[PDB]
Nucleic acid binder design. Structure first.
Ligand SMILES: Nc1ncnc2c1ncn2[C@@H]1O[C@H](COP(=O)(O)OP(=O)(O)NP(=O)(O)O)[C@@H](O)[C@H]1O
Ligand code: SF4
Length: 738
DNA sequence: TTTTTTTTTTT
């Protein structure tokens, strides 16, 4: 009844940690596919006897606790008469710096595998080996040592004793947590309309291990209707960790608020909110010694903490002088609910490697406002290189031998970009440039040694940047397949070399299979088959719940006036007349435009007071703008589709009574959107509908939902575009708006 | 045939 499930990597991480952060080497820009090619070549040099990728498992009773531990060896078999266990690892360190215990974590892991194999095969001795390789050089080194069963047993039991401090707190928390969840009731007086159907579908998806897409209108309560069923499934041992993913830092409060309410009702749970490094930094000196003190801060927080938020993290981090970022990544290993941005799961650079590399746990994702993951998902797998930045770094170097080789490598990359441009303002290529990748790798090797010996140099920051850009550019290039294209733009006195991800379906799908359950939900997720396709869902269930509000409180007026780009200057006065008549109505009014250029054009011919939105608006200014939407003002406001005021605004009651939308929201025709249109055309999809209509109409959907926020709120919606009564736009309009 | 605004976490 005392059981703790753990990976060998997680056991060694908390038992062998020591020293400072810079002593531990982390390459988050490692090209994995290239490394896996080296990994496979090493395993091809094995024998039919040396079996590869062998899973090793062990259950050991220690301190009355059953430690169920699992790991995977890269190879096991008899070699030279002795059984050999081989582990393959990528390294950025020099091979000469690699020796018997150079990396304690690596050798602790292979020793655990040895104890497992020796015990199950009556072996008395085993040879343990670490095969190290550098992905950019393909250089390989081997370190082989012999170990006795008794020595391995003593080492393994030592690691268990070091982890015992955590095991206990975890065991007691799981008992109290499941008890609280089993006795926990819906934290509100009664279920609202759709809540029972939504919760049941979320609970079933988590229990069966399936992907569920949900379009739920305002008023149904998407946060509690997703979190409560997910937490209940945790209390019934159906999932181990819940991830609440947000597209903006503001949306994390809703999840913490619902958890606070359930705590009041008896819920015993541990949650952590991950905050970006540049936001949780207290005020680097904690880096020295961090790994010698981080475990005790964790034990204090796990024992005395529940819902962990930014303030608490910084307090304990300052208290124990540990880096707050590394603290919170650690806490997420020991928390039940992880609240964090999409990047921590889907981005290739910052994803939580501890969880989404080799999952040994059941993970359930709750993706809030998933409509936002389409554009953002493409940005995570797209990157650029700029000729000007590379050349400007060259003009800072001072001809010193070390800087000269870097200056040369930078010029090679710059010339390769200019050559691939072919004197064309826009150039495209289906395949990735091997030469550009080769030049980027060489430049990286040349700058590495300088970065470690010249921090005093005054242009170090500029040189560190181009290093980051080329590193990240190389990392994105590892994903390049036939859902990518090369685009080279020659404008603004710069040649910008871009690797663009046109579709994230394959990459995201290979990520969602590592989780047990996935729930994508938003108020605007139409059509759900489009969003499912682009975000990697292949086998799934779709639930569309409509407004739980009275249909007599909303009045929708379609106005058939052409807003096509070629007719805007001709139809602007008709729009100005409609808006002037709207201005006569009582209450405040939000009028949305597809572009700033349209907003200013209509604004000019409007002879009445109008509050407009400017491109650059600080947080305070944004609060001032919305503050003028008093319940006693009579303000007409001009805003932009897809802008900061199209999402989030909660102008309830009489702060807003009229919303007007001027286009079907089509994105500006562009070469970026044309490549996306052509990709989907050549893959069996309506390209225009994928690149233009569906994102467009979804923006209309966003802005119109600013109007009715409560079942008491009433208002008028104005849809001004002859396309709102044409296909396919009318089908994409909400049923209440037609 | 069709005409854009803007968040996130990374050295
Ligand atoms: N059964 C319920 N009874 C009372 N209040 C509830 C109930 N369910 C949810 N709520 C509350 O109603 C609000 C719903 O918030 P949330 O789920 O974030 O948005 P929503 O209602 O889905 N609207 P939106 O996000 O704009 O589409 C919160 O204040 C909840 O606490
Ligand atoms: S305390 Fe701040 S500067 Fe120091 S390691 Fe942590 S995040 Fe970096």
């Amino acid at each position: 009844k005392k059981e703790i499930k753990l990976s060998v990597r997680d056991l060694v991480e908390y038992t062998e940690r020591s020293g400072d952060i810079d002593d531990r080497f982390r390459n988050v820009f490692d090209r994995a596919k290239e490394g896996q090619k080296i990994h496979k070549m090493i395993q091809k040099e094995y024998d039919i006897g040396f079996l590869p990728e062998v899973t090793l498992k062990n259950t050991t009773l220690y301190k009355s606790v059953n430690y169920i531990v699992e790991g995977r060896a890269a190879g096991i078999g008899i070699k030279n008469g002795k059984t050999l266990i081989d582990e393959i690892k990528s390294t950025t360190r020099d091979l000469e710096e690699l020796e018997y215990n150079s990396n304690k974590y690596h050798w602790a892991q292979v020793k655990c595998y040895g104890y497992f194999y020796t015990l199950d095969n009556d072996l008395e001795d085993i040879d343990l080996q670490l095969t190290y390789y550098q992905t950019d050089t393909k250089k390989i080194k081997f370190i082989r040592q012999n170990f006795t069963f008794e020595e391995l047993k003593e080492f393994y039991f030592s690691l268990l004793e070091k982890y015992s401090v955590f095991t206990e707190l975890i065991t007691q928390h799981i008992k109290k947590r499941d008890e609280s969840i089993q006795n926990l009731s819906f934290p509100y007086p009664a279920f609202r309309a759709g809540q029972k159907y939504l919760s049941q579908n979320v609970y079933s998806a988590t229990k069966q291990g399936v992907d569920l897409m949900v379009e739920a209108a305002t008023g149904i309560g998407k946060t509690i209707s997703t979190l409560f069923p997910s937490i209940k499934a945790m209390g019934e041992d159906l999932t181990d960790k819940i991830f609440y993913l947000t597209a903006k830092s503001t949306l994390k409060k809703a999840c913490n608020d619902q958890l606070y309410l359930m705590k009041q009702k008896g819920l015993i749970i541990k949650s952590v909110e991950i905050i970006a490094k540049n936001k949780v930094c207290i005020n680097c000196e904690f880096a020295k010694g961090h790994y010698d003190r981080v475990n005790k801060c964790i034990l204090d927080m796990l024992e005395n903490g529940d819902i962990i938020v930014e303030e608490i993290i910084k307090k304990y981090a300052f208290k124990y002088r540990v880096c707050p970022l590394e603290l919170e990544l650690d806490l997420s290993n020991f928390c039940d609910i992880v609240i964090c941005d999409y990047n921590y799961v889907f981005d290739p650079v910052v994803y939580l490697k501890r969880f989404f590399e080799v999952p040994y746990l059941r993970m359930s994702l709750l993706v809030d406002e998933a409509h936002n993951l389409v554009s953002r998902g493409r940005d995570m797998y797209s990157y650029s290189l700029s000729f000007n930045q590379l050349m400007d770094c060259c003009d800072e170097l001072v001809d010193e031998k070390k800087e000269l080789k870097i200056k040369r490598n930078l010029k090679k990359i710059a010339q390769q970009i200019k050559d691939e441009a072919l004197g064309k303002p826009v150039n495209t290529y289906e395949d990735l440039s091997v030469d550009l990748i080769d030049y980027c790798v060489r430049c990286k090797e040349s700058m590495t040694k300088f970065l470690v010996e010249e921090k005093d140099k005054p242009y170090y920051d500029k040189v560190l940047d181009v290093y980051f850009e080329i590193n990240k550019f190389l990392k994105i290039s590892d994903f390049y397949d036939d859902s990518f294209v090369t685009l080279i733009k020659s404008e603004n006195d710069d040649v910008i070399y871009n690797i663009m991800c046109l579709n994230t379906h394959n990459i995201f799908k290979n990520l969602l299979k590592k989780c047990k359950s996935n729930v994508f939900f938003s108020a605007t997720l139409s059509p759900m088959t489009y969003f499912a396709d682009v975000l990697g869902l292949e086998k799934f269930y779709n639930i569309r719940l409509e407004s739980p509000f009275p249909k007599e409180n909303l009045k929708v007026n379609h106005i058939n006036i052409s807003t096509r780009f070629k007719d805007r200057e001709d139809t602007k006065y008709k729009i100005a007349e409609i808006l002037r008549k709207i201005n006569e109505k009582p209450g405040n009014k939000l009028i949305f435009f597809p572009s700033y250029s349209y907003l200013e054009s209509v604004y000019e011919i409007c002879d009445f007071d109008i509050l407009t939105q400017e491109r650059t608006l600080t947080d305070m200014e944004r609060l001032e703008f919305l503050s003028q939407f008093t319940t006693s003002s009579n303000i007409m406001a001009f805003c932009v589709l897809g802008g900061v005021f199209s999402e989030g605004v909660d102008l309830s009651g009489d702060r807003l009574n009229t919303v007007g939308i001027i286009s079907v929201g089509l994105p500006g025709i562009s070469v970026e959107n044309d490549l996306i249109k052509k990709y989907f055309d050549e893959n069996g999809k309506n390209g225009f509908d994928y690149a233009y209509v569906y994102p467009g109409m979804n923006k209309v959907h966003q802005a119109g939902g600013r109007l009715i926020r409560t079942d008491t709120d009433t208002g008028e919606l104005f849809l001004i575009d002859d396309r709102f009564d044409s296909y396919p736009y009318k089908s994409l309009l909400p049923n209440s708006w037609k």
